[PDB]
Amino acid sequence: MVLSEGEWQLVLHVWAKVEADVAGHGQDIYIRLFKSHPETLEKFDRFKHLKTEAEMKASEDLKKQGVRVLTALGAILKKKGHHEAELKPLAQSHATKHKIPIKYLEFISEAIIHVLHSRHPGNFGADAQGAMNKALELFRKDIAAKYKELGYQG
């Protein structure tokens, strides 16, 4: 469960394209997440009322939230596995305050992969998607371990 440097470079090469417009990517990822797995939207007290994709796209608060998620995830990815410090606050808030199960982290990982596959075929072929999946699996494995330490089954 340790990524090679070549795998990390495939992850970071597609993430650089995400960074051309992190806000737009965040909107697409949230829309995909909520339309593939509607139950996840219920965890968001401020966004749970959104009824349609048009409302999600027009929500300035949701756009800002997407930027926060992707920027936090980008900082984790750029540590190339040395993300202990970054996972501490994230694991605590998601376990104890938002109460986000591991299955829901799997759902957002799937939404990320789906959106990168659609938007970035030039940097998200099979090998690149495999590397991104490995990076997200590592993130989820380490978050799950921290969840257990914090008292949350997940």
Binding site for ligand HEM (CB under 6 A): 40, 43-44, 46, 65, 68-69, 72-73, 90, 93-94, 98, 100, 104-105, 108
Q: What beta strand segments (E) does 20-148 contain?
A: none
**Minimum distance of ligand HEM from residue 72's CB (angstroms):** 4
- Residue of 112, 141, 137 whose CA lies nearest to 31: 112
**Minimum distance of ligand HEM from residue 17's CB (angstroms):** 18
CB of 40 or CB of 120, closer to ligand HEM: 40
Backbone phi, then psi, for 146, in 5-degree steps?
A: -70, -40
- Residue of 128, 132, 117 whose CA lies nearest to 73: 132
CB of 52 or CB of 96, closer to ligand HEM: 96
Residue 151 burial by Cβ neighbours in a 10 Å radius (0-12, 13-18, 19+): exposed
**Minimum distance of ligand HEM from residue 122's CB (angstroms):** 23
**Minimum distance of ligand HEM from residue 58's CB (angstroms):** 16
3-state helix, strand, coil in the chain (%, to 5): 75, 0, 25
CB of 128 or CB of 132, closer to ligand HEM: 132
**Minimum distance of ligand HEM from residue 68's CB (angstroms):** 5
Alpha helices in 79-125 (DSSP H): 84-92, 102-119
CB of 12 or CB of 72, closer to ligand HEM: 72
CB of 27 or CB of 40, closer to ligand HEM: 40
